[PDB]
Design a protein around this motif. Structure first.
Motif, PDB file in Angstrom:
ATOM      1  N   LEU C  71      26.887  37.811  35.368  1.00 30.64           N
ATOM      2  CA  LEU C  71      27.324  38.941  36.177  1.00 30.64           C
ATOM      3  C   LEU C  71      28.720  38.771  36.744  1.00 30.64           C
ATOM      4  O   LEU C  71      29.349  39.758  37.119  1.00 30.64           O
ATOM      5  CB  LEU C  71      26.351  39.179  37.332  1.00 30.64           C
ATOM      6  CG  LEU C  71      25.017  39.835  37.001  1.00 30.64           C
ATOM      7  CD1 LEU C  71      24.032  39.539  38.106  1.00 30.64           C
ATOM      8  CD2 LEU C  71      25.183  41.322  36.826  1.00 30.64           C
ATOM      9  N   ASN C  72      29.211  37.542  36.842  1.00 36.77           N
ATOM     10  CA  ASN C  72      30.597  37.346  37.254  1.00 36.77           C
ATOM     11  C   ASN C  72      31.596  37.964  36.285  1.00 36.77           C
ATOM     12  O   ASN C  72      32.574  38.564  36.759  1.00 36.77           O
ATOM     13  CB  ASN C  72      30.866  35.854  37.455  1.00 36.77           C
ATOM     14  CG  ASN C  72      30.204  35.310  38.693  1.00 36.77           C
ATOM     15  OD1 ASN C  72      29.437  36.004  39.350  1.00 36.77           O
ATOM     16  ND2 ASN C  72      30.499  34.063  39.021  1.00 36.77           N
ATOM     17  N   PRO C  73      31.436  37.872  34.959  1.00 39.92           N
ATOM     18  CA  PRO C  73      32.352  38.592  34.063  1.00 39.92           C
ATOM     19  C   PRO C  73      32.136  40.094  34.032  1.00 39.92           C
ATOM     20  O   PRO C  73      32.926  40.800  33.397  1.00 39.92           O
ATOM     21  CB  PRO C  73      32.051  37.971  32.696  1.00 39.92           C
ATOM     22  CG  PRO C  73      30.662  37.523  32.808  1.00 39.92           C
ATOM     23  CD  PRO C  73      30.545  36.986  34.190  1.00 39.92           C
ATOM     24  N   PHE C  75      31.474  41.716  37.150  1.00 38.07           N
ATOM     25  CA  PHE C  75      31.851  42.139  38.490  1.00 38.07           C
ATOM     26  C   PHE C  75      33.142  42.936  38.450  1.00 38.07           C
ATOM     27  O   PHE C  75      34.153  42.467  37.924  1.00 38.07           O
ATOM     28  CB  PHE C  75      32.007  40.905  39.371  1.00 38.07           C
ATOM     29  CG  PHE C  75      32.229  41.210  40.815  1.00 38.07           C
ATOM     30  CD1 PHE C  75      31.186  41.626  41.615  1.00 38.07           C
ATOM     31  CD2 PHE C  75      33.477  41.052  41.378  1.00 38.07           C
ATOM     32  CE1 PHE C  75      31.385  41.891  42.943  1.00 38.07           C
ATOM     33  CE2 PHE C  75      33.677  41.312  42.704  1.00 38.07           C
ATOM     34  CZ  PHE C  75      32.632  41.736  43.488  1.00 38.07           C
TER      35      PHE C  75
ATOM     36  N   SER D  68      35.189  31.674  38.076  1.00 36.48           N
ATOM     37  CA  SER D  68      34.965  32.762  37.138  1.00 36.48           C
ATOM     38  C   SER D  68      36.021  33.853  37.276  1.00 36.48           C
ATOM     39  O   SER D  68      36.976  33.747  38.045  1.00 36.48           O
ATOM     40  CB  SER D  68      33.573  33.351  37.320  1.00 36.48           C
ATOM     41  OG  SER D  68      33.376  34.392  36.384  1.00 36.48           O
ATOM     42  N   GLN D  69      35.837  34.921  36.494  1.00 31.83           N
ATOM     43  CA  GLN D  69      36.700  36.093  36.589  1.00 31.83           C
ATOM     44  C   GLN D  69      36.562  36.778  37.937  1.00 31.83           C
ATOM     45  O   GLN D  69      37.510  37.405  38.420  1.00 31.83           O
ATOM     46  CB  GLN D  69      36.364  37.066  35.461  1.00 31.83           C
ATOM     47  CG  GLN D  69      37.046  38.413  35.552  1.00 31.83           C
ATOM     48  CD  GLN D  69      36.131  39.490  36.087  1.00 31.83           C
ATOM     49  OE1 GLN D  69      34.936  39.489  35.824  1.00 31.83           O
ATOM     50  NE2 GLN D  69      36.691  40.413  36.847  1.00 31.83           N
ATOM     51  N   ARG D  70      35.397  36.660  38.564  1.00 30.17           N
ATOM     52  CA  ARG D  70      35.187  37.256  39.873  1.00 30.17           C
ATOM     53  C   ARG D  70      35.978  36.539  40.956  1.00 30.17           C
ATOM     54  O   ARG D  70      36.476  37.186  41.883  1.00 30.17           O
ATOM     55  CB  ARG D  70      33.693  37.252  40.199  1.00 30.17           C
ATOM     56  CG  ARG D  70      33.365  37.531  41.642  1.00 30.17           C
ATOM     57  CD  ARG D  70      31.906  37.845  41.826  1.00 30.17           C
ATOM     58  NE  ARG D  70      31.623  38.207  43.206  1.00 30.17           N
ATOM     59  CZ  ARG D  70      30.435  38.595  43.644  1.00 30.17           C
ATOM     60  NH1 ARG D  70      29.414  38.668  42.806  1.00 30.17           N
ATOM     61  NH2 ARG D  70      30.269  38.908  44.919  1.00 30.17           N
ATOM     62  N   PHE D  71      36.130  35.218  40.848  1.00 26.82           N
ATOM     63  CA  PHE D  71      36.830  34.431  41.855  1.00 26.82           C
ATOM     64  C   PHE D  71      38.116  33.803  41.334  1.00 26.82           C
ATOM     65  O   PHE D  71      38.562  32.799  41.892  1.00 26.82           O
ATOM     66  CB  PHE D  71      35.922  33.330  42.409  1.00 26.82           C
ATOM     67  CG  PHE D  71      34.541  33.791  42.764  1.00 26.82           C
ATOM     68  CD1 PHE D  71      34.287  34.380  43.986  1.00 26.82           C
ATOM     69  CD2 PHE D  71      33.493  33.611  41.888  1.00 26.82           C
ATOM     70  CE1 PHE D  71      33.016  34.792  44.315  1.00 26.82           C
ATOM     71  CE2 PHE D  71      32.222  34.021  42.215  1.00 26.82           C
ATOM     72  CZ  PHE D  71      31.985  34.611  43.428  1.00 26.82           C
TER      73      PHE D  71
END
Lengths: 91, 48, 151, 219
Positions: C71-73, C75, D68-71
């Motif tokens: 789910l991080n990619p 977000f 990650s891409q989120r952080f």
RNA sequence: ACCUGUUGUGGUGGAUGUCUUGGCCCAGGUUCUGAGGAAGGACACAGCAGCCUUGCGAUACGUUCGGUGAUACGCAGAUCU
RNA sequence: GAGUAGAGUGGCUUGGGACUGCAGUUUGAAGAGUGACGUGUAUCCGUCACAAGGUGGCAUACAGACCUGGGACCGAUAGUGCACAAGUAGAGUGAUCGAAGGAUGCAAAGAACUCCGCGAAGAGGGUUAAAAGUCCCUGAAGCCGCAACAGGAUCGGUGGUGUGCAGUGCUGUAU
RNA sequence: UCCCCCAGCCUGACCCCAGUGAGAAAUUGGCAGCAGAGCUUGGCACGCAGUGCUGCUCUCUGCCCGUCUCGAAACACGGACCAAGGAGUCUAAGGAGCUUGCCAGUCGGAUGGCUUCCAAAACCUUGAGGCGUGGUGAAGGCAACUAUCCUUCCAGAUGGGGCUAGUCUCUGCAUGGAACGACCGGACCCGAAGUCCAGUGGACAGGGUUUCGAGUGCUUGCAAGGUCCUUGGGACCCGAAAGGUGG
RNA sequence: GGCAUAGGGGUGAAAGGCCAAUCGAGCCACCUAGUAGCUGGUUCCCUUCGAAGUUUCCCUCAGGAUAGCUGGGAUCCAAUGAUGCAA
RNA sequence: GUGAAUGGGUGCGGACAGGCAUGCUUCUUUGCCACGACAGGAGGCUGUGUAACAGCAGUUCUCCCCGUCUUCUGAGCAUGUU
RNA sequence: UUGAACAAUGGAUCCUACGUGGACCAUGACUGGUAAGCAGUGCUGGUGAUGCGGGGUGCUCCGAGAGCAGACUUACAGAUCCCGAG
RNA sequence: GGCAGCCAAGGCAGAGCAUCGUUGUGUAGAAAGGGCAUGGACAACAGCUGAUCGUGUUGGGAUUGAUCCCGGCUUGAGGCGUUGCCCA
RNA sequence: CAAUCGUGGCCUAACGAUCCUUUGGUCAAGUGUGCGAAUUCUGGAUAUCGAAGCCAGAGGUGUCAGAAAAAUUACCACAGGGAUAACU
């Protein structure tokens, strides 16, 4: 063991505790179900609707159309009126 | 968010948001309460 | 007032039911433990109506199942064009109004990745983000600014 | 089950979580939180008093971007500096770095020059804020140390440097207003996105097309 | 005389009120047994002691030594300033 | 780092799904590489790590038992089964089961002496602020004895009602 | 059924004359200017008036409570007596009201800073993050038109300007219903004409539909407390015949 | 008298008898406060409002969910008499 | 072959009724031009008040006729007027 | 003549916690049965949930419905006495 | 529900005050209707108590009622109560 | 000829959920006499390999709103029931 299943005894009483009314009587009914040709035509009609100011001046022009005839004949009649009144005097 | 849930989702015509307590699916295809009575594929779909 | 004078009671209804034998649960149909099942028991037999009426899409399986759903990619918080010019110090918004320079809006600074194109734009700005809708691109380009893809 | 509209319970308490007479239970009550706060504080200051004339944390940690891409944009502290950052700073001995209070991490490498430069300048502001005491108390004394830096060894609470996050919270700061560039005027960013996404999907098709083209070329 | 009652009083009874060298609960620390004989179990041991004692072991409610500094005590009995 | 990793198969396990992990058995590598990259397979490429040996403090758990500090907890039918000579008395061949049981008084000052009696008691007389009398703070209800008074055949009852008659209080009370 | 002549009966209004009359209300704690329903008599100690209690008597009554039940005085169940104990509780998640604070934010007591016991409190914004700000599609994914302002219609809360005890225009909140020539996402059909480029030929684009969404149309949010509840838990209290593990 | 056979087991010239007054599965401790749509009980006062034994579905017929009746909280409006005179 | 009693559905108006003029439509129609061009005559007429119709007011007047030009389809939805 | 009467403190919009889901009685409206204080139904009202007056007594009949009192008057039904009223 | 003719009263805006009108059965059930009562925390009563607490017992008074207050006696403290609010 | 009529049987009966499987479609290919027009298997790709997905049917639950299902007890037991038989 063996029950007494069906009865319609207290049902009118329960049903008449509060007035038996239709929920939405003044509410409009949806256009879904209305015939497709009539729905399309309502849409296109409303699309083509002119504006109230254009309509006002259109009605004004329509009223002014037969004015030269109407005003002339009316003033002629109004001129002949007092002769009629003085004749009606002699009765 | 309460008014949106008022009523019953399983009543045809009522477009009530089903009451989901704390369960917000991440896969919106495999969501909670979206299969039987939500697609005519699953023998019926609640009417609009 | 008088109503405020009544900051009383802790279990009001339970303590009020003292003296009444059935404790608010009836004489004919007793309060008996689990007279319909435990939990969601009977969702297809004797709570079939309840489940059909209050939870339609229960009881089934639909969709592609994704093993190890990252789910991080995925977000991607989104904002809108209506909430852009709030993010520019209006000193810039004033000194750039009719002139050619456009202020720069870095959405990642505020926590938005994609920019959605709902809301009108008053003056062109330059927007750095990770994604844009074509509506957002169209509105920004017409206002005068530019969208920038930023890691 | 409710005679109402409440959601489906999904309760998850079916397995003897309750400390009754028959069961031990699966309950942990954190009544120690209040006392343990003070106890942690006390043992932390005892750590300070123990390793006194040194940072209370003690090793200089690097600054690495969250994963990650989120952080991506959020920075934080690492475990230790890369030997490339050490060699760039001027340290070629990892064990000596560690003994003077710089943390090393041979597992880490620099996947880019920005992290290398950032942690290099971090180590270089270290080793200048650093006052090494000399061994055996009266032999050689290094440069910068002024013979009263040893008289006044002060234990700072936080390590001079700014917050770890204040390194991404500076890269996330837009520029001043600027003029557009003609490529920024002509470029269609949505078209670019859709193009680079259709690219990864049309691969085998963009081989079958070539194959058909060359078959028809033969014919 | 018997019965029923109401008072007064006396018995049977141990409710109430008040407390508590006890419990329960939370937090902190320690976990320190044993073939050099543990944990437990016996039998012994006191002038008058049966029980109890996280008393004790034929040196048997105690031995050496330290701290304290005139008691201990239910009776007595010589030691003790 | 070899009967290893892996594979066929069987069984447990897991959210782990053409099988997360483990185990038996048959099989059993590479090391001119291997393992993992959550859909079985074949073909290419990439990233990360280097299994089949071992040490290793910290943050962590801690209803027992000991040393402590506390409590919007219980207050002797409560709180531990045990506030007490309680895992005791007692029961069972045994494995085991398992109670009831707190309070004199400030101080024992714990009732001298007298009469009667076999004696306990009792009647005096004492201690004491008080018998508070080793049953000992207080001593409820139920039940019982006695005396006084009021009645006493009848579901013609208990209870209610409106008076009355006896006994008994209470309140007010003009000149 | 209508009309005429002769007459007549009952009765309304008005004009004239005499006679006659002047209408309702007026203490309600008191004072205010009027208005004003109470007063007399006899008796009572330094006994009288009233009121309880106990017993007895008399008139009229008076079945034994709790419970299950259409139905209990029941020859239906529990109940000899008294005392003390004794049964809708806490918890995770949630629902719908109510209260309070803040607001496109809110909360943040995981943790961090301080200061004999109190204090494991109080205070502080280092805080990731939770919920909310966007939805739609199985997914690949995509993502809410509108350049002075403003979605439309019906009903409708206020308010404005004229006007008039007739009474006209403008505003149009909330709520309910309908609509959309609107738009976002999905599904169809005819097409893919047209414009364009971060150019492997790719990105959108047009017109039509009995189309769907837990969609948007000036974000109705967050947190705490409280009430009534739900589900898992011993689960309001007591209650099986049973099943299992070890002795 | 000694010793041996133990609980789904023993032993029985068989009665399912007997295995410590226990047997068509002994007893003992624990899971366990097992579950019970069934029976019984469910603790103060006053005021106000106030039902149903009917619908549909259910391995359903002593039970449930679902409408109905029953209570409460409301929201938008509507509707809602009363000067003795004198001053 | 008839057919009650008792019943059931609907309607009974604004002071939103009713009438009139006009607009729009890709729907309908043969029904468009046309939101167009042209146009004469008769008249104590019309209204309030009345069984005495007197009296009083004049408003693009009344009728041939909502005319003629081959003569002007409806429906639905709106704009105005009364 | 504001174009039927009468009534009407009401219409619209919702939310929400429960109990109930054994019924029974009465009537040419009936069905099964010889019939049943039987079984099953229909309209309405009652009983359940409801006391009070009368039917001697009686959950369902007849009257009437229930805050505490005072006065008057009545309903059903009553007046030989029991027992108010010839 | 003070900006009131004056005093008396009321004076806590879901309170109170004045007038008028309506309506009073109830099982199950309910009340964001109102109260009585018990243990304890935080506060107030410069609360009471050896000139006798609390318990209990017997009379009296108040209350629609839950219940409250007082006199007598027992008894003697190893004390108790009233109000707001909170935890049960 | 046309108006029309015709998406089964003149009308009132003639039938079936989740999950699973299967087939068809989607996809992919093919056409495309030049263009397109696209579901997934997640470190990036390929493969008429395989699997998954969405859409429409079909395989059936007749107890037909849809558990997978034989007896006996006079050796018996429990919770109840006068909701229900045997005696008055």
């Amino acid at each position: 063991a063996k029950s007494k299943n069906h009865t319609n005894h207290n049902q009118n009483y329960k049903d008449h505790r509060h007035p038996i009314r239709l929920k939405g009587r003044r509410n409009q009914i949806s256009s879904k179900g209305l015939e497709q040709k009539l729905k399309k035509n309502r849409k296109k009609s409303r699309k083509g609707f002119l504006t109230p100011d254009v309509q006002k001046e259109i009605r004004e022009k329509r009223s002014k159309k037969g004015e030269a005839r109407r005003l002339k004949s009316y003033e002629k009649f109004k001129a002949k009126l007092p002769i009629w009144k003085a004749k009606h005097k002699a009765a | 968010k309460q008014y949106k849930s008022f009523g019953a989702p399983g009543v045809p015509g009522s477009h009530a948001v089903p009451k989901l307590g704390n369960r917000k699916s991440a896969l919106r295809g495999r969501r909670h309460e979206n299969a039987r009575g939500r697609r005519k594929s699953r023998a019926f779909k609640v009417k609009a | 007032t008088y109503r405020e004078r009544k900051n009383k009671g802790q279990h009001q209804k339970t303590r009020k039911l003292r003296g009444h034998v059935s404790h608010g649960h009836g004489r004919v149909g007793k309060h008996r433990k689990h007279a319909s099942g435990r939990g969601n028991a009977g969702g297809q037999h004797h709570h079939r109506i309840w489940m059909d009426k209050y939870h339609p899409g229960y009881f089934g399986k639909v969709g592609i199942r994704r093993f190890h759903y990252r789910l991080n990619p995925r977000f991607c918080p989104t904002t809108s064009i209506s909430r852009l010019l709030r993010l520019v110090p209006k000193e810039q918004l004033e000194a750039c109004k009719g002139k050619e320079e456009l202020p720069v809006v870095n959405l990642l600074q505020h926590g938005y990745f994609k920019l959605l194109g709902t809301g009108r734009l008053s003056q062109g700005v330059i927007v750095k983000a990770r994604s844009f809708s074509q509506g957002a691109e169209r509105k920004i380009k017409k206002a005068g600014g530019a969208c920038i893809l930023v890691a | 089950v409710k005679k109402g509209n409440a959601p489906v319970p999904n309760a998850h308490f079916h397995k003897h979580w309750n400390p009754t007479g028959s069961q031990k239970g699966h309950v942990r009550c954190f009544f120690k939180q209040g006392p343990q706060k003070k106890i942690r504080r006390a043992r932390r200051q005892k750590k300070a008093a123990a390793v006194f004339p040194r940072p209370v944390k003690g090793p200089l940690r690097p600054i690495v971007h969250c994963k990650s891409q989120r952080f991506n944009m959020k920075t934080r502290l690492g475990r230790g500096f890369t030997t490339l950052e050490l060699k760039t700073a001027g340290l070629t001995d990892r064990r000596y770095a560690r003994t003077i209070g710089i943390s090393v991490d041979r597992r880490r490498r620099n996947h880019c020059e920005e992290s290398l430069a950032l942690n290099a300048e971090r180590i270089k502001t270290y080793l200048s804020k650093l006052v090494l005491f000399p061994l055996k108390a009266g032999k050689k004394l290094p440069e910068g140390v002024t013979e009263e830096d040893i008289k006044n060894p002060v234990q700072s609470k936080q390590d001079g440097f700014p917050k770890a996050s204040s390194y991404g919270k500076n890269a996330l700061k837009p520029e001043a207003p600027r003029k557009l560039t003609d490529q920024e005027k002509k470029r269609l960013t949505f078209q670019f996105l859709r193009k680079v996404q259709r690219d990864t999907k049309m691969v085998g098709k963009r081989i079958k097309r070539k194959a058909k083209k060359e078959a028809k070329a033969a014919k």
